[PDB]
Write a protein that binds this ligand. Structure first.
Ligand SMILES: C[C@@H]1OC(=O)C(c2ccc(F)cc2)=C1c1ccc2c(c1)NC(=O)CO2
Length: 249
């Protein structure tokens, strides 16, 4: 009886804490190591979420794993923007209740410009007054936004799921009385915003791949969950096996 949207609300991961330790200095190494542990905890939640996401179990298991590994940074970034919007009206980057970045933290992390790019997305949520239902559907479209260039196991199952979620977003936006007279314009602003995530996420991934490769030299710690994702994904990236999907490019 519940709609896919109702299911998406039910399965949305609860907000987690970073374990930020106020007895340690805010060096880039400490901040990045803390963020990496946070992201590891969030990614374990993303895997559990994906297991009960409507339609996802109908893709081959290998494709489910691939899509998580090809989208993880987009999923985390998009959820970060939502939390920042909801809990601070996009004044800060709300990584977790115990890890909230102002401009000082953005500098201390050694990721100022990357954080500024993310902050711009959260500001677009304010401009749009993005709704929770739009957010939940768009997050699934991000899961389905980047594919191997040499093929998923089932193209057909992937295209069916992606088409279904695009239709969910289009129907929701165009049928909502809050959007009357402007609903197609809003739909295209939302799809343009999804496309803009690829630029930002590529940049975030490049820096993360760097500190991963140089982890021991740079003293930037990564939890096993991220080591699993990055060890599987980085060779595919280096080989050129990544195809971002765009609505308008
Ligand atoms: C994965 C983590 O989770 C997030 O939400 C973000 C994030 C950070 C800033 C932003 F604007 C949007 C998302 C993360 C992250 C990104 C790059 C990184 C590392 C972690 N870690 C490094 O060592 C250096 O590169």
């Amino acid at each position: 009886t519940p709609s896919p949207v109702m299911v998406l609300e039910n399965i949305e991961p609860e907000i987690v804490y970073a374990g930020y330790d106020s007895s340690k200095p805010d060096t880039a190494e400490n901040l990045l190591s803390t963020l990496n542990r946070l992201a590891g905890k969030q990614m374990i939640q993303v895997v559990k979420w994906a297991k009960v996401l409507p339609g996802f179990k109908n893709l081959p298991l290998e494709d489910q794993i691939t899509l998580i590994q090809y989208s993880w940074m987009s999923l985390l970034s998009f959820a970060l923007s939502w939390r920042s919007y909801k809990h601070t009206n996009s004044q800060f980057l709300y990584f977790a209740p115990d890890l909230v970045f102002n401009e000082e933290k953005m500098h201390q992390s050694a990721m100022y410009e990357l954080c500024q790019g993310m902050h711009q997305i959260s500001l677009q949520f304010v401009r749009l007054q993005l709704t929770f239902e739009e957010y939940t559907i768009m997050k699934v479209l991000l899961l389905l936004s980047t594919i191997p260039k040499d093929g998923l196991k089932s193209q057909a199952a992937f295209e069916e799921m992606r088409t279904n979620y695009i239709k969910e977003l289009r129907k929701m936006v165009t049928k909502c009385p809050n959007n009357s007279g402007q609903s197609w314009q809003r739909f295209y602003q939302l799809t343009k915003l999804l496309d803009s995530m690829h630029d930002l996420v590529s940049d975030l991934l490049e820096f993360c791949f760097y500190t991963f490769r140089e982890s021991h030299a740079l003293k930037v710690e990564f939890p096993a969950m991220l080591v699993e994702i990055i060890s599987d994904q980085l060779p595919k990236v280096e080989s050129g096996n990544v195809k971002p999907l765009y609505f308008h490019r």
